Ligand binder design. Structure first.
Ligand SMILES: C[C@H]1O[C@H](O[C@H]2[C@H](O)[C@@H](O)[C@@H](O[C@H]3[C@H](O)[C@@H](O)[C@@H](O[C@H]4[C@H](O)[C@@H](O)[C@@H](O[C@H]5[C@H](O)[C@@H](O)[C@@H](O[C@H]6[C@H](O)[C@@H](O)[C@@H](O)O[C@@H]6CO)O[C@@H]5CO)O[C@@H]4CO)O[C@@H]3CO)O[C@@H]2CO)[C@H](O)[C@@H](O)[C@@H]1N[C@H]1C=C(CO)[C@@H](O)[C@H](O)[C@H]1O
Ligand SMILES: *[C@@H]1O[C@H](CO)[C@@H](O[C@@H]2O[C@H](CO)[C@@H](O)[C@H](O)[C@H]2NC(C)=O)[C@H](O[C@@H]2O[C@@H](C)[C@@H](O)[C@@H](O)[C@@H]2O)[C@H]1NC(C)=O
Ligand SMILES: *[C@@H]1O[C@H](CO)[C@@H](O)[C@H](O)[C@H]1NC(C)=O
Ligand SMILES: *[C@@H]1O[C@H](CO)[C@@H](O)[C@H](O)[C@H]1NC(C)=O
Length: 830
């Protein structure tokens, strides 16, 4: 058959010293299918922390492709092996995970949790079924685990458009960075994130762990409910298990490994407007002017490939987008506290009168095939691709960006087409098993050759690295170079948005779902994709509001701005062959816009604190319900609702001509952020029909949470100049708590050493006769220097009113309390 598997030749635990396991595996018997088997395997298991188990399987007699440490820094491997069935067990006293190596034929291994004596990863084979074996050929690695089909709820393995957040049973997820529109369901998209979250509904409900395979090669992942299997066409097995035990802790352990999410500037949480096909400077000025007249907040104006001189990077169309007019335009944006972001492609047009091409050829920075720079095909025409694995190409990139930034102020960079995208598929090299692999991954849902519409697998990078191995790293690498370029040309916290991503990208860039469509499906699709990229360590995520491709309708756009105003990254964008869809064009949507974007701007400090938490602990801004309610199994399969932070839930309408929604409400009291009187109270989790007017969206806050809000404004700059309103939602079960992070909105290292930031924590508890509200302040300096003042406190969740020495609403006015000063407020019931 396919493979016969491996036997344990020798296995030992390194005594006394830091406990790790080393083992040598020998091929049982050779098989011709899918290429020759690797004869000897070096197998190690080791704890990187108490809550992280590393399993590394390599060729004992060959250094195989591994993702470079310079690209993704991580602890080095343990030492390798020397030159009833038997078991070798590895465990640590402060670890909840136990690794077991089974000396069967073929061999197996399991990771089980001490806390529940439950198996989390089970690679024990079914002797008669080679689909369950570990197989290790040069271009085919097979790793398989069994799962308790009903108890195991899986999430992740992006990037894919799915109607559901939780992974459906019986499917093949292909991970291979490709220029494929996100309006296509199931197909492999722009990014690859070989990570999944496993939430166990039983025996101990809510029990969570994570599984990451640190491999950049193309792969099919097969999920059949009771089994999951990796089919990888290269590299090694570098497997990481994250103990949990909560969903929160898993993402903490995961991002600790791949990198904490990069902080975002304050202005990034404002609304963005973009469009492919803005004709000239006069049109973008007009769009900004009309957003003002509609009194709809517009923070950042974007320019697509239109601004370039015939689609070449680091140039300006001397006719439609002349330099002096653009300089004026950006100056005026800044004067009104607004920002500007242009787009970049990786391809460099082969124009002999083009400065970027000339310089790129001098530093020898382009990806090569058969000894010559690979000829690509994108917008400007024939292009060469910069090899972002070459440090000289990374210097060249910084140089070009510096040059452009000197003549034209930019507030951020949009990097696109970085799969890399190619419009003309190259012919495969004769006799190459790289351009023609033995196992075909399910690219584009039809076993399409990996070389399709991209750079051939036989192209070479710096250090003799093939495109075959480094393909899923391309967008990741450009994001590093681009962020480097931004940091060295400006002292402010950079902003960048990338299409193609890999595990770890969130440490460098923001992401958007890419090319969605103006269809009701895509509106709903935006939510699982949004929650997935939270797991992937990229909390700054959003979809093109009102849909990129195809023309939108008034009702679709209206319902989309209602939802899209709560994306971490909120932006309107569309193709040029569709109708315009700026929010002012329809009155019903502009009125919706002012409402929803109004609430968002009030929630700016909240969003920013969540961004702070993300960089600090990996915890996503937009998160699944089961993050806050892991003991509620009904929340596991919700794909239509989500949370902003811990206690704010959004429940949008996703179907046309509707005026109501059947949204799920976990146990507790919920209150509308649009009407403090409108509340939802359930003693057990249940669906509830909510009135959803054409201009309204249900956004509720759960009890036990304190949120610091400011005032509405046209810009984020102006919003910070407004007083603070404290929203306190009480609970008869627990003291309410809240958190506010304050900085200048542009410090390079967020919350670092020194004092250009302030952290404030809020606390509230009801007694029989008295209510106490108090804060704690760390690094009081910065907040104090900002004159932030809290003049109002609204109290929800109580059945009795309160005041200074169903449910009711209590308000405390004329407080004038300095945010940067700790306080204890005492109220009395009536
Ligand atoms: C604006 C954006 O423009 C570009 O993207 C465009 C495409 O150029 C455009 O063509 C269009 O592409 C769509 C298709 O219309 C749509 O149909 C879908 O394609 C799917 C198919 O639906 C699906 O069937 C599948 O095809 C497979 C089959 O499944 C498989 O069986 C097999 O079929 C045959 C095979 O081909 C034969 O060789 C033989 O073997 O027989 C078999 C059958 O037996 O293979 C085919 C595939 O070959 O999968 C298809 C996808 O490959 O979806 C695509 C999109 O992927 O629309 C898109 C989206 O607009 C650019 O590529 C894009 O980058 C660009 N967007 C950026 C540009 C700008 C401007 O600067 C920015 O503004 C944007 O934000 C950027 O995102
Ligand atoms: C190399 O870059 C030049 C500068 O952008 C290109 O010339 C410009 O082409 C524009 C249309 O793409 C046109 O509006 C500009 O007037 C023109 N500017 C100048 C100074 O020539 C050039 O394009 C080539 O030459 C022109 C005359 C056309 O025939 C194009 O089709 C050519 O490609 C670029 N050359 C190449 C080979 O890409
Ligand atoms: C607020 O909500 C309550 C409860 O649904 C409702 O009776 C009241 O009319 C609402 N007020 C406004 C101004 O919509
Ligand atoms: C509330 O509690 C405080 C402190 O315990 C006490 O001094 C005060 O008299 C109480 N007020 C009422 C109305 O009971």
């Amino acid at each position: 058959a396919i493979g016969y598997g491996y036997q344990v030749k020798n296995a030992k635990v390194d005594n006394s010293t830091g406990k790790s396991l080393t083992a040598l595996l020998q091929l049982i018997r050779n098989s011709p299918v899918y290429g020759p088997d690797i004869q000897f395997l070096s197998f190690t298991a080791s704890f990187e922390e108490d809550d992280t188990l590393r399993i590394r399987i390599t060729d004992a007699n060959n250094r195989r492709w591994e993702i470079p440490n310079e690209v993704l820094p991580r602890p080095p491997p343990p030492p390798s092996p020397p030159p009833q069935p038997t078991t070798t067990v590895l465990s640590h006293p402060h670890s909840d995970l136990v690794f077991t190596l089974f000396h069967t034929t073929p061999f197996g291994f399991t990771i089980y949790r001490k806390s529940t004596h439950d198996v989390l990863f089970d690679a024990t084979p079914i002797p008669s079924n080679p689909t369950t074996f570990l197989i290790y050929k040069d271009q085919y690695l097979q790793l398989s685990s069994s799962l308790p089909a009903q108890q195991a709820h899986l999430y992740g393995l992006g990037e894919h458009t799915k109607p559901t957040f939780q992974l459906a049973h019986n499917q093949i997820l292909t991970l291979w960075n490709a220029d494929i529109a996100s309006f296509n369901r199931d197909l492999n998209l722009y990014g690859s994130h070989p990570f999944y979250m496993d939430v166990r509904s039983s025996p101990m409900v809510g029990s969570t762990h994570g599984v990451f395979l640190l491999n950049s090669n193309g792969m099919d992942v097969e999920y059949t409910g009771d089994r999951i299997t990796y089919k990888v066409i290269g590299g090694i097995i570098d497997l990481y298990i994250f103990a949990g035990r909560t969903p929160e802790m898993v993402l903490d352990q995961y991002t600790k490994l791949i990198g904490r999410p990069a902080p975002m500037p304050y202005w990034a949480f404002g609304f963005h407007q973009c469009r492919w096909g803005y004709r000239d400077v006069n049109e973008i000025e007009t769009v900004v002017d009309k957003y003002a007249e509609a009194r709809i907040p517009l923070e950042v104006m974007w320019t697509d490939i239109d601004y370039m001189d015939a689609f070449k990077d680091f140039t300006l169309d001397p006719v439609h987008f002349p330099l002096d007019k653009m300089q004026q335009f950006v100056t005026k944006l800044h004067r009104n506290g607004q920002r500007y972001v242009p787009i970049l492609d990786p391809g460099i047009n082969t124009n002999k009168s083009y400065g970027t091409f000339i310089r790129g050829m001098q530093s020898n920075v382009f990806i090569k095939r058969d000894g010559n720079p690979y000829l690509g095909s994108v917008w400007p025409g024939p292009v060469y691709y910069p090899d972002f694995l070459d440090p000289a190409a990374r210097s060249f990139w910084v140089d070009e960006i510096k040059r452009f930034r000197d003549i034209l102020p930019i507030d951020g960079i949009w990097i696109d087409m970085n799969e890399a995208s190619n419009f003309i598929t190259s012919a495969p090299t004769p006799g190459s098993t790289l351009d023609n692999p033995p196992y075909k991954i399910n690219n584009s849902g039809g076993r399409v050759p990996i070389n399709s519409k991209t750079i051939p697998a036989t192209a070479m990078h710096y250090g003799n690295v093939t495109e075959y191995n480094a393909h899923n790293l391309y967008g990741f690498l450009e994001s590093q170079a681009t962020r480097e370029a931004l940091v060295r040309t400006s002292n402010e916290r950079p902003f960048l948005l990338s299409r193609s991503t890999f595990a770890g990208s969130g440490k460098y860039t923001a992401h958007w779902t890419g090319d969605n469509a103006a269809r009701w499906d895509d509106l709903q699709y935006s939510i699982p994709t949004m929650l997935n990229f939270g797991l992937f360590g990229m909390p700054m995520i959003g979809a093109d509001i009102c849909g990129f491709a195809e023309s939108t309708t008034e009702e679709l756009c209206r319902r989309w701005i209602q939802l899209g105003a709560f994306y971490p990254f909120s932006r309107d964008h569309s193709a040029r062959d569709t109708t315009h869809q700026e929010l002012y064009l329809w009155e019903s949507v502009a009125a919706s816009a002012r409402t929803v974007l109004g609430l968002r701007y009030q929630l700016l400090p909240y969003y920013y604190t969540l961004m702070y938490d993300a960089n600090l602990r990996g915890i996503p801004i937009a998160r699944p319900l089961f993050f806050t309610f892991p003991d509620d199994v009904a929340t596991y399969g919700i794909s239509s609702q989500f949370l902003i932070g811990r206690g704010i839930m959004v429940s949008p309408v996703l179907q046309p001509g509707a005026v109501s929604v059947n949204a799920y409400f976990p146990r507790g009291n919920w209150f509308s952020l649009f009407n403090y009187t409108s509340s939802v109270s359930v003693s057990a989790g249940t669906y509830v029909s909510l009135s959803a007017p054409p201009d309204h969206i249900n956004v509720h806050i759960h009890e036990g949470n304190i949120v610091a809000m400011q005032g509405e404004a046209m810009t984020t700059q102006a919003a910070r100049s407004t007083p603070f309103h404290l929203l306190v939602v009480m609970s008869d079960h627990v003291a309410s708590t809240g958190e506010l992070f304050l900085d200048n909105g542009i410090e390079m290292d967020i919350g670092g050493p020194g004092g250009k930031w302030t952290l404030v924590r809020f606390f509230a508890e009801s007694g029989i006769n008295n209510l106490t509200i108090s804060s704690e302040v760390v690094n009081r300096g910065y907040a104090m220097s900002q004159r932030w003042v809290m003049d109002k406190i609204t109290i929800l969740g109580l059945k009795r009113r309160v005041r200074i020495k169903g449910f009711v609403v209590s308000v405390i006015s004329d407080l004038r309390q300095l945010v940067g000063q700790a306080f204890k407020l005492e109220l009395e019931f009536e």
